Amino acid sequence: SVDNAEQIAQAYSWLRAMSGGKLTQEQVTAGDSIIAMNGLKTFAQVIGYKMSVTGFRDISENGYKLIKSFEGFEPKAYQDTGGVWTIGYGTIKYPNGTRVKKGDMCTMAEAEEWLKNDCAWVDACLDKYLQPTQNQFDALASFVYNVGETAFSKSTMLKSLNGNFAGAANQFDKWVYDNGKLIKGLVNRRAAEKKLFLS
Amino acid sequence: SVDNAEQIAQAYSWLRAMSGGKLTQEQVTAGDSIIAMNGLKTFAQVIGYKMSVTGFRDISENGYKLIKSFEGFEPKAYQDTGGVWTIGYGTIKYPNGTRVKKGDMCTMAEAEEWLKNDCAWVDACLDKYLQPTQNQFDALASFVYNVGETAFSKSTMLKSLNGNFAGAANQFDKWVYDNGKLIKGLVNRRAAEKKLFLS
């Protein structure tokens, strides 16, 4: 409703998961055009992003640790696989809505700030599809932020959540395929989310 | 590149799968605004829809039969769960880009025409992620049209495709959950795609 530049980075990282893990410069250029032209709400609405209050738990420092681990610190802006300029821990939009560009530089304490804004939709999403999971949804937050809202809502992994927590823990492992192929980073990532799923 | 009104219905049914099985009037109103404002290409680009030539096989009449079976014939326009006016076999945009509206009426031969346009992205999608599967991808086409491009590209079901065709056939069954819940229509649907997966 009330537009805020904070939410641009959020819609985009939500879109990034719905687009299978990456954005193309085509998407970003299209969506920035929409945002300039129609307003942030039209952008969020057409993709299905319902901007979010959830007094359930927040991503703890350790949750951010593994999230950080998989994104990979980049202290200078670099052109990603899709062609979008990117910096820090996967950040393409600063909290003030401006774009990462060629030349930008950061520190880890800067980059983790932008990452918290990047991720700030994950707990709201986790809330609507889930029992309070104390504070070991830090593995789930890393999971939904990687895999996306629609993916989580259709998952057999969600079935065993709401209460076989042991099959959920084994479900992390199955999500390692991309494009029919097995991805070492994913099982590596899946492993660390499965393992962190066990306090 | 060259815009065509045919492709509006296609981007939307592709978006419908990426949005977890339904569109809200919010999405449609947003996307029609974008299309009027920025052009069809900006709409397709921001959602990740790469409009498609694939001389591999086409959805046979029987493939359309089960697709028809699950959509459900509606000879008069009706407001869907999401609030979008809908007619025939799940059609919300006619091939000329105009919207289904309150008052519209059809026949089965009309509705199956619009359905073929609705689905005309499925075979291109099937081509890029897949071996020629003779003409028993009529179960896969019904699968991808329901479940969406990103879903198919991350599926363990795709892993066994490219060649354990027997685990694929059993994979259909697992996709029955939505929102953590089991859906009778889905296993019903999954069943008929699993079974049709065996000539």
Residue numbers in the entry:
A (entry chain A), B (entry chain A): 2 to 53, 56 to 133, 136 to 167, 169 to 205
What does the study report here?
We solved the crystal structures of PHAb8, PHAb10, and PHAb11 and unveiled that hyper-thermostable PHAb10 underwent a unique folding-refolding thermodynamic scheme mediated by a dimer-monomer transition, while thermosensitive PHAb8 formed a monomer. Results showed that PHAb8 was a monomer, while PHAb10 and PHAb11 formed an asymmetric dimer. Interestingly, PHAb8 showed high topological similarity to monomeric PHAb10 and PHAb11, with the typical catalytic triad (Glu-Asp-Thr) located at the coil region. In contrast, PHAb7, PHAb8, and PHAb9 completely lost their activity after treatment at 70°C for 1 hr. Our results showed that PHAb8, PHAb10, and PHAb11 were denatured with transition temperatures of 41.4°C, 53.7°C, and 59.9°C, respectively. Interestingly, signs of aggregation were only observed in PHAb8 but not in PHAb10 and PHAb11, indicating that PHAb10 and PHAb11 underwent structural refolding without precipitation during heat treatment.
As a proof-of-concept, five peptidoglycan hydrolases from the Acinetobacter baumannii proteome (PHAb7-PHAb11) were identified using PlyF307 lysin-derived peptide as a template. To understand the catalytic mechanism and thermal stability of these peptidoglycan hydrolases, we attempted to decipher their structures and eventually obtained the crystal structures of PHAb8, PHAb10, and PHAb11 by X-ray crystallography. Despite their lower amino acid sequence similarity, PHAb8, PHAb10, and PHAb11 superimposed well with T4 lysozyme, especially in their Glu-Asp-Thr catalytic triad regions, suggesting that PHAb8, PHAb10, and PHAb11 may be phage-originated. All these observations together indicated that PHAb8, PHAb10, and PHAb11 were highly evolutionarily related to T4 lysozyme and might share similar catalytic mechanisms of action.
